[PDB]
Design a protein around this ligand. Sequence first.
Ligand SMILES: [Zn+2]
Ligand SMILES: [Zn+2]
Ligand SMILES: [Zn+2]
Ligand SMILES: [Zn+2]
Ligand SMILES: [Zn+2]
Ligand SMILES: [Zn+2]
Ligand SMILES: [Zn+2]
Lengths: 392, 367, 31, 475, 400, 109
Amino acid sequence: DKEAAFDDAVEERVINEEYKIWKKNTPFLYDLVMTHALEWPSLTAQWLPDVTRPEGKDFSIHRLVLGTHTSDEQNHLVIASVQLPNDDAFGSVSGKIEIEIKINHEGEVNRARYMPQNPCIIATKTPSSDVLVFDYTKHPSKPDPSGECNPDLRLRGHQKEGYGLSWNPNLSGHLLSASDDHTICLWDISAVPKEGKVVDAKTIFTGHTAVVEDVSWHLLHESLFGSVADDQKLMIWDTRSNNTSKPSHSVDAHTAEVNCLSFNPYSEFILATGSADKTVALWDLRNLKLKLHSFESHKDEIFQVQWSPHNETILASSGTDRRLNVWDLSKIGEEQSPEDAEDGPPELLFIHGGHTAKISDFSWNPNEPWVICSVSEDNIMQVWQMAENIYN
Amino acid sequence: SKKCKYSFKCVNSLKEDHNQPLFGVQFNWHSKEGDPLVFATVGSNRVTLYECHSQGEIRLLQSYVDADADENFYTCAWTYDSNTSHPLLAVAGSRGIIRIINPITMQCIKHYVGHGNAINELKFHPRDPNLLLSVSKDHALRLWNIQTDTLVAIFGGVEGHRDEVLSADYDLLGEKIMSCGMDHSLKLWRINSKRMMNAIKESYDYNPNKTNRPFISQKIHFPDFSTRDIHRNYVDCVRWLGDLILSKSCENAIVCWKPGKMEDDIDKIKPSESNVTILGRFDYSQCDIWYMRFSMDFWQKMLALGNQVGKLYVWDLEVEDPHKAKCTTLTHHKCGAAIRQTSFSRDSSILIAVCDDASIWRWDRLR
Amino acid sequence: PPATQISDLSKRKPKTEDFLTFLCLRGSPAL
Amino acid sequence: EYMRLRQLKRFRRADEVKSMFSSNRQKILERTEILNQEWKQRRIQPVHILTSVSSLRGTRECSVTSDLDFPTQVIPLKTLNAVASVPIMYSWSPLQQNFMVEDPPECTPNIDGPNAKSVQREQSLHSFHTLFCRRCFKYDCFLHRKCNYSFHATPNTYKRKNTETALDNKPCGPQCYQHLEGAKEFAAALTAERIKPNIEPPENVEWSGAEASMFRVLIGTYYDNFCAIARLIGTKTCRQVYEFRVKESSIINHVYNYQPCDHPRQPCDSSCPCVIAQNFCEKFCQCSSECQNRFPGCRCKAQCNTKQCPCYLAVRECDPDLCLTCGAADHWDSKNVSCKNCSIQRGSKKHLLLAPSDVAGWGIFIKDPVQKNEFISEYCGEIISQDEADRRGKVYDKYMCSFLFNLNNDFVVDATRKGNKIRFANHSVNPNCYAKVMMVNGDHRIGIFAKRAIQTGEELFFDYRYSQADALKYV
Amino acid sequence: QADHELFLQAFEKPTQIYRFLRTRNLIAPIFLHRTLTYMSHRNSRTNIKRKTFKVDDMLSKVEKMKVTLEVLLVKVCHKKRKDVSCPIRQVPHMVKSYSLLFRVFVAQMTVFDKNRRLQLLDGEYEVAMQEMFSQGPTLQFTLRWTKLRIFYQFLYNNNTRQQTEARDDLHCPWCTLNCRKLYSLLKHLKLCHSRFIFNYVYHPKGARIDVSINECYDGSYAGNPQDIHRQPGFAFSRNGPVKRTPITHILVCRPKRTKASMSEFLTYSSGHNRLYFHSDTCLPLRPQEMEVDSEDEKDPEWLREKTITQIEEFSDVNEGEKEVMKLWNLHVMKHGFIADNQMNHACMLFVENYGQKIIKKNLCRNFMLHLVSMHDFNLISIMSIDKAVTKLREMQQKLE
Amino acid sequence: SLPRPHDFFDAQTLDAIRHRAICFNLSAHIESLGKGHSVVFHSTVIAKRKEKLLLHWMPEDILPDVWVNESERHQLKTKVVHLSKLPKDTALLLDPNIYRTMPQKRLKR
Ligand SMILES: [Zn+2]
Ligand SMILES: [Zn+2]
Ligand SMILES: [Zn+2]
Ligand SMILES: [Zn+2]
Ligand SMILES: [Zn+2]
Ligand SMILES: [Zn+2]
Ligand SMILES: [Zn+2]
C-alpha cells in the first residue's frame, strides 16, 4: 500500500537525521572512530592474531578477514590491513584501511573463520553444500581474472547452506560446522594425505529437529562442545560418547529462535546465548536448569554475542535494531538514580548508534584492549573504541 | 469583411486562488466519445484539473502543488500509457525538470533532470506516445523516451540555435520538427532519417542492467534547413498547417510561408537552400507582448489567438485565401487581462482562454 | 517573560482544532 | 506593355497561391482523416475527483471562485515529491585542438574520367598545391588560415632545388632510351640547354589529353627517368615515352606569433620576420639549411625535465625532427616516451571528472593522484583576435561568464562555445595548478601543470590572475 | 503580516522535527546521555569490578532458589520470527496467557497475566464494551477459587524578537531533558539541536539565550550518492547489495579532553565522495562505468562531418579530387600523425586502409597526382611513391 | 554561491509529521496535561461488586487492565506515566514511526 511506502520514506528521513545527530556527538563518546565504505558489503569480520609494530613510527598494523557480497560480479575473500594510532597522534597518513589480498571465491562468504594454531589456513562457508579450506599464503595476492581457483581443500559433508563454523583451539584441526539440514558434521583434517580433493566427515551429529544456527567448541575442554538451533533449545554435546543422537543436555533456554552462542574465555562454566526474543541470557554449566540474569534492552533480533577477550565481566551483542550494546556483569542488580533508571538498566554500559543498516558481524581485537570492528549491510565498516572515562 | 460564421458567447468565468499568472491550458484529446471534457491548467507553483459540463458548469477535480522549491510551471502536455490506458500529464518550467503525473493514482511517476535551464515547451509524437520533445533555454532541444527513461537525441550544437529556443512543433504525421528561437532563426530538424529511426529503435531496445556502458545519445549538430529572412525579431510560436508553416513574431502578424521556391517540394529540399516564399498574413492589434501562443483545433478548420488587452480573434481557415477578412473577435466587459493561451476541445465546440489574472474564461458555440 | 518556552513551542507546531487553548492559543502571533 | 505583364504575373501568382492552398487543404483533410481513424480505437480511462486525504489532517485547501454566479468549490491540494536539481549551464561542443575562427570555372576536368584535356603541370596541380598545409598534413586545415596574400599559396615553395641526378647502368629491361642509339645523347643535349641523332621516326601511338598531362607531371617529378615514368604510367612503353618526349621537345608583451619566412637569396639576418620579431628560425620556414637563427636541438640522454636541457630552458617542447637522443622522436606511433618535454605534442592528458563544485557551478575533479610538476591537460578552445575577444567579452558580460584565456600578443583562446573538459576549473587564491604557454612545433599552446602534489578526487583550481581578462569582474 | 507567517513557518519546521525526535528517542534511544563527557553529572556510580564470576550461580541459588451465549477459550502464543504477530487460538514457552471471550455485545476477559499472578478477583468488571452502567444483565466473569532563571529570545533577521521565559531551569524545551548544569545545558543545546544557533549573552538579572535559525546546516543525504537521483519507486530500495566507490573517514582520533570553560560561549577523508555527471548529456555517472571510457577522443563526429561538408562545398575541384582530399583528411584526423618522418608510414597506412575505397571510386590517377604534389611539398620520397604505387597495383591484381 | 544542500526532509514528510503530531496530541494530551514528558490515560468505571473492579484505559493496547476496589477506582480517575516507564513492547503502537524495521524484506540469515 501507499501507506507502507510513505512510512518507509518518513523512517528513512528520521534515520538520516538521527545519524547526523550521532555524528555531531561523536567526539564526546569515543576515543577513536574510523569509518570506511567498502565496494561490496561483507558478511564476516574477524581480526587476525598477528600484529606488526614498526620502529620509530607512532602506529601499528593489524590484519582482518573479510568477505564479499556481490549481486552479479565475482566474489572474493579480501584480507585487509588496518593501521591503529597506538597511543600518540594521526590526521593524514594516506591509506589507513587499505586491502592486502583478494582470493577468488565461488559465492558470497557467510563465515571466514581462521585456524587458531596456524592462522594461514582459513575456512569459509559457501552458499553451496561444500565448505572450502583456503590457504592465503599459497595463493597470489592479485586475483586471477578467471574462475575460482583451487581452494587446496574442499570439505563436503553437508546437504544445504550453513552459518555456523568453529575450530578446535586445544587440538589442531577438528573443524565443526552447523548447517541447515538439521545436522552438524565433524572434520578431522590435518591428518589427511597431500594433494587431497574431498575430505569425508568423521562424525555426523543429528539431534536437532530444526536448523542449527551456531556451533562452538569449549574453550577449556578439548572433548566437549555446545550447539544451538532455532527450535528454542541449547544442547551440550560430548565427543567420544558413543552416542551421536542424544546430547548430554537439552535446555530449551529461550522462547523464540536462538541465534548465537559464546563461551567465557576465563570461566569454565559461564556462557551466553542470543535469540530473536530480544534477550541475552547467561548460564553456568554446573547448574543448567537455573538461568542466570537476562539482559533486555534490544528492540529486534540479536544475531551475535562476543565475550571480551581481556575482561571477566564484559560482553557485547548486536542485531537488526541497527545498534550494539555493551554489558557489564559486575554492575547488575545495584541501586540507581531515577535519571539513570530512565536512561537504562545499570548493567548496560554503552549503546553504539553509528550504523544505518543491520549489523552483520563484529569482533574485538586480541592485540588491543577495548577496540571493536563492526560491519553493516550498507557497505560500511567501522573501527571504534569508547572513551576511557566510561570504564575508568 | 464578414466576421465568419461561428458565434461564441461567454457562459462562465473562474478565478484561481493563488492570484498568480497562469501560463498553460490543455484539453485532453485522447478521451473517448461522450466522456466529459477535462482540461488542465498550470501556473505559479500549482497545476489544476477542471472538467466541463453542460450549461457552463466547470467543476474543479484535482489540484497539486510543489512547496519544496521555487518551481514556476510554464507548460503542459497530455499523453497516455498504452499498457494500461491511464492518461498522463507532463509539466515543466523554471527549474528545468520534467514531472510526469498520473492523475488516476495522484502521484508523480517519473522525473527527468538533464536540461541546463528553464523549459518553454513540451510536445508528444503524434504516432508514438512515449516520445516527448522539450525546448529549453540552454539553446538545445531534447527527445526523451519516457517508457525506458533514456535520452534519445539532442538537437543543438555547431549549427544549432545560438539562443533560447521558444517553441517547436511536429508535423501532421510526425516526420519533421520546426523550431523557433530568440536568435531570429527557424531551423527544420528532420526525424525521418535512418539515423533517427535506428536511434529510436535502440532506445526502445535498451536494458541498463545487462550493459555497463551508458546510452549513446545522438548529437545532431546540423539542421536540415534554416531560414532567418522571414521574421525580423524573435519568433514566439510556430505551427504546421499541413505542408505550410504558420509563425508569429513581434510584427503583429502570423505569416503563412513554405520552404524553398513557389513550386519547391518540402521533402526534396537541400540543406543549402536559401529561398522562402510568403503567402499571407493574419492581422491583429495590441499584441506587442511576447510569449503568447496561438492555437488551432484538431481538424485545422479554425485558429485563435489571444491579446494583451483581453480580446480573442478566431479566424476561419476554410475560406478561400484566408489571409483576407477580419475574423470574429470575442470580448467581454469584465475581461481586461492578457490571454496567455487558448485551447480547443477535440470537437470544435468549447473554447477556453486563460488570462494572466488567474482567471479562466469559457466560450461556447451556439451552432 | 510572557508565556513560556514550552508553551510557545506548543503553539508553533499545532495550530488547528487541537490547540489546547490556554496561552498557546492566545495572542502569540503579532507579539 | 510592362504594366500588362506585371498584372498578368500577379494574376498568375494569385492562381498559384489559390491552387497551393487547395492542395494543402486536401492534404490536411486526408491526414486528419487517417489520424481520426487511428484514434477510433482504444478506450482511455476517465479521471475522478480528489477528496480529503487522511495522511495529512493539517493539509492545505484550494478554493476557486466563479464570477458569473455559481457557488464556490474547495478542494485539498496534493503535495509533489522533492527532486534534486543541477547547476545551470549552456550547450557547448567538445574540442581537442585549437580552432581558428574568422568572421569548374578553372576548366580542370578530372584526369581519371574520360573527359580530360591536356594541361601544363602548373595548372594540373594548382588545387593540390593551393589547398595543402604542410604544418599539419591536412587539406584546408582548421588551424592555419590563408588570406590569399601569397601567390597561389606558394606552390611547392622553393625547396625542390635538388635537380642533380646521376645516370646509372643496368637498364630496367629490353626497352629503354639507353638501348636506342642516339636517344641518350639527344636527351642529354636537350637537358643541356638550361636557361641530330635518333633519326628513327616516332611510333604511331595516340596520346590523349589525360595521358599527356600524366606524362608531363611524371616528367616534371622524375626529371628524365624515362624507364621509371613508363613503369609508373599505365602501358606507355619506353619507346613510346621517348617518342612523345622527342615530339614535345622544341617545336613549341614581448611575445609575437611565429610566421614562416620565405626570403630568397638573402641570409636570415635582420631582414625576415623570424629575425625581426625575435623568434627562432624554425624548420617550417624556407630559409637556408645553415641559418644562424635556427634553434639547435638538445642532445640530452633522456627525461629533458630539468633545466639543463636547452629545450626546456627555452620553454619549448622537444621537436621530433631535431631531438633524437632524448627519445621524443622514437615511438611516434607508440607511447611511453622517455622524454618528459613532449606531453602537449603527444596529447597525453589525465582523466578528469565532472561534478558540481563546492565554490560555484561546476568543477573538475582529478581521477587519480598526480605528482608535482606533471602535465594534466591543455586549454583547448577557439582562436580569436584581440578585438574579437573584446567584442565577445562585451557580449558575454550580460550573464557574467567569461572563459577567455590570453595566449600571445594577437591571439586569444575562447572555450565558451567549444572547448575541453578542463574549462570547468575555478579561480582560487591558493591554486593547485598553473598554466604555461609552450611553443610546440611552432604553435603556442597552453598547458596546465600541477603546482603541488594532488590527492585522489581533489577538486582542481588554478589562478586566473595571469589572464588578460579581469578575474574579479566575472568571479 | 506575511513576515510573521514566514517567521512562524521557519521556526516551526525544525521545532516539529525535534518534537517528533523527542517523542521517539524516549523509547528507542540512539545513545545514553550518562556516557557523555559534558553530561557525566548523571550516573554518579563508581566501579566495583573486583569479584569473580564463578560465585554468581551460588549467590542466585542461595538468594532465590533456596439470548444464547457461546463460551470459547482464547490462547495466545509467543511470536516467533516467522510469525508477524502473536498467534491466537480460539478453543470453543508455547502459551503466553489464556483469555475468555464472549460473543453474542462482546466482552473479553483474561485469567492469567504476564507474571501468572492470582488475578481476576471476584466482582463486577467495568471493562470496555462495544456494540456488535446499564439496567440490563451484564456479562462479567471473574476467575478465582471459592533559582537560576533562564530567558529565551527568538531572533528573526536580527530584527524580530519573541520575549519568552523558561518554566523549568536547566531543562531543554525541545527534548525535555535534564542537564542540571548551565554549561552542560548550553553544550547539549548546541550539539543536539544543531539546526539553531544558541548565543548565550548573559543578563544583569539572569541569563538570556538567543536562538536563531542556522543558515548553512548541511543536512543532505548521507548515504549512497546514487540514491538521490534515482527515479521514484526505486530510490532507497534497500533490497540488495549496491556497488559504491570506496571512501575513508576519521571522525575522532585522540580527543584532548579539556575541562569545563565558559569562554567558549561568551574530518579527514580519502577517496571519491561525490556523484559525477557526464560532460555530454549531463546525466549521473554510475561507478560501474567511471574508471574507464574517459569519453574524450581525438576526432569528434561533428568535426568530421564539418570537414567533409567544407571540402565538398568547394567550387573549383573535380569529384575524384574532392573524394581523395576528404579521405586523406579523415585518415590524418583519425590517426593523428604529427611528424615528417611519420609521413612515410602515414602514406603506407593510407594506401593499406583505404585501398578498397580508392579502387571502388576509381581515383588511382588522382591519388598518384596527390602523392606527386605531396612529394613536391617536401617529405616522402620517390622510393615511397613507387613502393605505394606497386602496392596499389598488387592490390588491384589481387582484387581482380 | 555554494550549491544548495537540498535538505532531505522536504515538505511531504513535514506534513505527515505534523498530522501525526496533531493526532497524537489530541489522543494523549502529552503537551497539555502530560507536562511534555508523560502520557495521560483515562479509565472507565461503571459498576463494581464486592465478593474488586476491572478498569480499561482509553488508549488501547498500551496498559494492561487491573483489578481494584471502589475506593481505588474513585481515586484512580486519571493516570500519568513517564514514557521511560511505559512497557517496551506496548509503547511501539503509539506511533508507526516510533520504531520500524526499515528493511523488512525476507531471506537474509
Ligand atoms: Zn594546418
Ligand atoms: Zn625563418
Ligand atoms: Zn629568413
Ligand atoms: Zn633562417
Ligand atoms: Zn633535452
Ligand atoms: Zn629537445
Ligand atoms: Zn627531450
